[PDB]
Design an enzyme around this catalytic site. Sequence first.
Site, PDB file in Angstrom:
ATOM      1  N   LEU A   1       0.324  14.315  25.475  1.00  0.00           N
ATOM      2  CA  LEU A   1      -0.151  15.632  25.912  1.00  0.00           C
ATOM      3  C   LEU A   1      -1.473  16.040  25.261  1.00  0.00           C
ATOM      4  O   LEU A   1      -2.177  16.909  25.781  1.00  0.00           O
ATOM      5  CB  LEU A   1       0.907  16.715  25.654  1.00  0.00           C
ATOM      6  CG  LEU A   1       2.349  16.547  26.140  1.00  0.00           C
ATOM      7  CD1 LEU A   1       3.214  17.648  25.552  1.00  0.00           C
ATOM      8  CD2 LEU A   1       2.449  16.540  27.657  1.00  0.00           C
ATOM      9  N   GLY A   2      -1.801  15.430  24.121  1.00  0.00           N
ATOM     10  CA  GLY A   2      -3.078  15.692  23.454  1.00  0.00           C
ATOM     11  C   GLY A   2      -3.320  14.905  22.179  1.00  0.00           C
ATOM     12  O   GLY A   2      -2.457  14.847  21.304  1.00  0.00           O
ATOM     13  N   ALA A   3      -4.506  14.308  22.076  1.00  0.00           N
ATOM     14  CA  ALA A   3      -4.926  13.579  20.877  1.00  0.00           C
ATOM     15  C   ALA A   3      -5.720  14.479  19.936  1.00  0.00           C
ATOM     16  O   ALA A   3      -6.536  15.291  20.373  1.00  0.00           O
ATOM     17  CB  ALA A   3      -5.751  12.349  21.257  1.00  0.00           C
TER      18      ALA A   3
ATOM     19  N   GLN B   1      -7.627  14.430  15.708  1.00  0.00           N
ATOM     20  CA  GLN B   1      -8.062  13.583  14.600  1.00  0.00           C
ATOM     21  C   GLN B   1      -7.003  13.623  13.492  1.00  0.00           C
ATOM     22  O   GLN B   1      -7.222  13.120  12.389  1.00  0.00           O
ATOM     23  CB  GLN B   1      -9.432  14.033  14.075  1.00  0.00           C
ATOM     24  N   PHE B   2      -5.852  14.218  13.812  1.00  0.00           N
ATOM     25  CA  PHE B   2      -4.751  14.405  12.866  1.00  0.00           C
ATOM     26  C   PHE B   2      -3.441  13.831  13.413  1.00  0.00           C
ATOM     27  O   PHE B   2      -2.597  13.344  12.655  1.00  0.00           O
ATOM     28  CB  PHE B   2      -4.595  15.891  12.515  1.00  0.00           C
ATOM     29  CG  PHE B   2      -5.710  16.431  11.655  1.00  0.00           C
ATOM     30  CD1 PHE B   2      -5.536  16.579  10.280  1.00  0.00           C
ATOM     31  CD2 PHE B   2      -6.940  16.784  12.217  1.00  0.00           C
ATOM     32  CE1 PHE B   2      -6.567  17.069   9.476  1.00  0.00           C
ATOM     33  CE2 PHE B   2      -7.979  17.271  11.421  1.00  0.00           C
ATOM     34  CZ  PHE B   2      -7.789  17.417  10.048  1.00  0.00           C
ATOM     35  N   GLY B   3      -3.283  13.885  14.729  1.00  0.00           N
ATOM     36  CA  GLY B   3      -2.124  13.296  15.377  1.00  0.00           C
ATOM     37  C   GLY B   3      -2.076  13.523  16.870  1.00  0.00           C
ATOM     38  O   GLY B   3      -3.039  14.003  17.472  1.00  0.00           O
TER      39      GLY B   3
ATOM     40  N   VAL C   1       0.401  14.877  20.405  1.00  0.00           N
ATOM     41  CA  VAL C   1       1.525  15.672  20.892  1.00  0.00           C
ATOM     42  C   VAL C   1       2.061  15.010  22.157  1.00  0.00           C
ATOM     43  O   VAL C   1       1.302  14.724  23.080  1.00  0.00           O
ATOM     44  CB  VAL C   1       1.143  17.147  21.162  1.00  0.00           C
ATOM     45  CG1 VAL C   1       2.369  17.953  21.556  1.00  0.00           C
ATOM     46  CG2 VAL C   1       0.510  17.767  19.936  1.00  0.00           C
TER      47      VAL C   1
ATOM     48  N   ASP D   1      -4.605  31.973  11.853  1.00  0.00           N
ATOM     49  CA  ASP D   1      -5.195  31.082  12.859  1.00  0.00           C
ATOM     50  C   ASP D   1      -4.783  31.518  14.284  1.00  0.00           C
ATOM     51  O   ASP D   1      -4.361  30.702  15.119  1.00  0.00           O
ATOM     52  CB  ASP D   1      -4.749  29.643  12.555  1.00  0.00           C
ATOM     53  CG  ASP D   1      -5.572  28.585  13.278  1.00  0.00           C
ATOM     54  OD1 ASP D   1      -6.591  28.891  13.939  1.00  0.00           O
ATOM     55  OD2 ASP D   1      -5.172  27.413  13.183  1.00  0.00           O
TER      56      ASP D   1
HETATM   57  C1  LIG Z   1      -1.383  20.915  22.308  1.00  0.00           C
HETATM   58  C2  LIG Z   1      -0.318  21.107  23.380  1.00  0.00           C
HETATM   59  C3  LIG Z   1      -0.713  22.304  24.237  1.00  0.00           C
HETATM   60  C4  LIG Z   1      -0.272  19.839  24.224  1.00  0.00           C
HETATM   61  N1  LIG Z   1       1.008  21.391  22.739  1.00  0.00           N
HETATM   62  N2  LIG Z   1       1.156  21.464  21.357  1.00  0.00           N
HETATM   63  C5  LIG Z   1       2.460  21.758  21.155  1.00  0.00           C
HETATM   64  C6  LIG Z   1       3.072  21.903  19.809  1.00  0.00           C
HETATM   65  C7  LIG Z   1       3.987  20.937  19.399  1.00  0.00           C
HETATM   66  C8  LIG Z   1       4.579  21.028  18.146  1.00  0.00           C
HETATM   67  C9  LIG Z   1       4.245  22.081  17.300  1.00  0.00           C
HETATM   68 CL1  LIG Z   1       5.014  22.182  15.680  1.00  0.00          CL
HETATM   69  C10 LIG Z   1       3.323  23.048  17.708  1.00  0.00           C
HETATM   70  C11 LIG Z   1       2.728  22.955  18.968  1.00  0.00           C
HETATM   71  C12 LIG Z   1       3.106  21.853  22.397  1.00  0.00           C
HETATM   72  C13 LIG Z   1       4.423  22.129  22.791  1.00  0.00           C
HETATM   73  N3  LIG Z   1       5.414  22.370  21.897  1.00  0.00           N
HETATM   74  N4  LIG Z   1       4.728  22.160  24.106  1.00  0.00           N
HETATM   75  C14 LIG Z   1       3.788  21.932  25.040  1.00  0.00           C
HETATM   76  N5  LIG Z   1       2.515  21.664  24.703  1.00  0.00           N
HETATM   77  C15 LIG Z   1       2.152  21.622  23.393  1.00  0.00           C
END
Ligand SMILES: CC(C)(C)n1[nH+]c(-c2ccc(Cl)cc2)c2c(N)ncnc21
Length: 256
Positions: A16-18, A20-22, A24, A130
């Site tokens: 779902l997203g890259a 520079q830290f990890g 998702v 933040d």
């Molecule tokens: C960046 C994006 C929009 C793909 N993203 N980031 C998180 C996310 C995951 C774990 C934590 Cl601890 C905080 C946020 C997330 C999520 N849960 N559900 C859907 N998209 C998410």
Amino acid sequence: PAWEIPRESIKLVKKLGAGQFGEVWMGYYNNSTKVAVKTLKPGTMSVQAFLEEANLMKTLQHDKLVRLYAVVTKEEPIYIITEFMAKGSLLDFLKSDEGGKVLLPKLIDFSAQIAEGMAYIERKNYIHRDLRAANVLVSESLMCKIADFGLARVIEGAKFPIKWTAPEAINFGCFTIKSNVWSFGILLYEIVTYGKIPYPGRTNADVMSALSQGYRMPRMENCPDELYDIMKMCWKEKAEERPTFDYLQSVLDDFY
Ligand SMILES: CC(C)(C)n1[nH+]c(-c2ccc(Cl)cc2)c2c(N)ncnc21
């Protein structure tokens, strides 16, 4: 404690997203439950400070805050498993074709939902530090939930968002719930404009100069006076003279 789960029980389906830290990922907890998985890329930090976020979520449990479900912290890739939010981040969403076609009715609702979760955090006696649209997530039912508690505190990998940070927080390192209120007013700008960058054309440096000189973003096109008044309130120079998040949730629900 009761947050550790065996890797087995988690299937990572689609990225779902890259960072520079990890990464998702969208995935499944033992096939039944749709979850999101926050991946840590090893060596980057802090297989601890990566978990500070999760550790904070163990305490901060409100409906308008992304819920932690579990963690995997025994093998080399560490996971934070949370509630899955279908529509991604509020920023991304507002910019999508679908987001571009939601009228103020729902925008104000989005705004008031965030003000609600923030009213829990003030009550709880915490600060986010933040707060911004990229750190708010949206589910299928168009629920806004606050995420990213990397910088959340009860009073390092970090990087607070300059254009979202209150002047007394920038200049005197003074982060309080009232500084979050500042950040919320900026988040209102983000909502109203459908995910535009604050202070368009200005660098972090410029902004900040300009803040030290009493600069506020001028009333924006397609933003009603009453809404701008709420924004203006969150930006009162004196931190003590800014509203509570409870007043914000009230005043926001009153648009009808
Ligand atoms: C960046 C994006 C929009 C793909 N993203 N980031 C998180 C996310 C995951 C774990 C934590 Cl601890 C905080 C946020 C997330 C999520 N849960 N559900 C859907 N998209 C998410």
